[PDB]
Ligand binder design. Structure first.
Ligand SMILES: NC(=O)C1=CN([C@@H]2O[C@H](COP(=O)(O)OP(=O)(O)OC[C@H]3O[C@@H](n4cnc5c(N)ncnc54)[C@H](OP(=O)(O)O)[C@@H]3O)[C@@H](O)[C@H]2O)C=CC1
Ligand SMILES: COc1cc(Cc2cnc(N)nc2N)c2c(c1OC)O[C@H](C1CC1)C=C2
Length: 157
């Protein structure tokens, strides 16, 4: 499969200043569960945000810098290179990946962060007319996960 994996807020904010706008450990645990043993493709800037490869899956960074060679990352330099990767590939961020990728992906794992944050980066507007809810499961709140949130899984209709 080829999937978006993204958390966005009530106005589709994903990012602020090259970071997530929220602290929400449940969602990062969700990312882990979903992606472990599989492949991430991210934009260069998102890679700079996580700063190192994530363990126990394959990490692929899309970048135009051909001098890019990082330990345990695989570089690619075009959108097209994605479509040849073996297996279940998650588009992992960021704003520009999502824009390039959203009409190409089979499905999307979105966490809707039921808040309104300040962002400088956004997820593309989409329409549920295009997208079928295979599941919708509320996140559980606790002291350390204090923002309401819903795990959507959308298949393209
Ligand atoms: N909420 C969420 O689920 C997530 C949010 N984010 C957020 O997203 C924001 C980052 O978004 P954005 O600024 O768009 O950054 P991106 O992470 O999408 O990276 C952009 C970079 O990726 C490379 N790139 C993208 N497309 C291509 C292409 N087609 N060919 C060659 N290179 C390409 C370029 O690298 P180069 O300049 O080296 O050529 C470009 O500068 C941050 O705010 C971050 O916090 C990130 C992940 C998840
Ligand atoms: C933009 O920054 C991040 C993006 C992301 C990507 C990301 C986060 N949340 C969601 N829902 N989708 C995503 N694609 C993550 C993230 C980020 O900050 C560290 O943290 C952890 C990694 C191990 C450290 C997980 C994710």
């Amino acid at each position: 499969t080829l999937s978006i994996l993204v958390a966005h807020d009530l106005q589709r904010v994903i990012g602020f200043e090259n970071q997530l706008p929220w602290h929400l450990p449940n969602d990062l645990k969700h990312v882990k569960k979903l992606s472990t043993g599989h492949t991430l493709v991210m934009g260069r800037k998102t890679f700079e945000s996580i700063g190192k490869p994530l363990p126990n899956r394959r990490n692929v960074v899309l970048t135009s810098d051909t001098s890019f060679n990082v330990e345990g990352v695989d570089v690619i330099h075009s959108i097209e290179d994605i479509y040849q990767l073996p297996g279940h590939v998650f588009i992992f961020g960021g704003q520009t990946l999502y824009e390039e990728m959203i009409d190409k992906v089979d499905d999307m794992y979105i966490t809707v962060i039921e808040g309104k944050f300040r962002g400088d980066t956004f997820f593309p507007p989409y329409t549920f007319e295009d997208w079928e809810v295979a599941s919708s499961v509320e996140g559980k709140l606790d002291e350390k996960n204090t923002i309401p949130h819903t795990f959507l899984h959308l298949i393209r209709k």
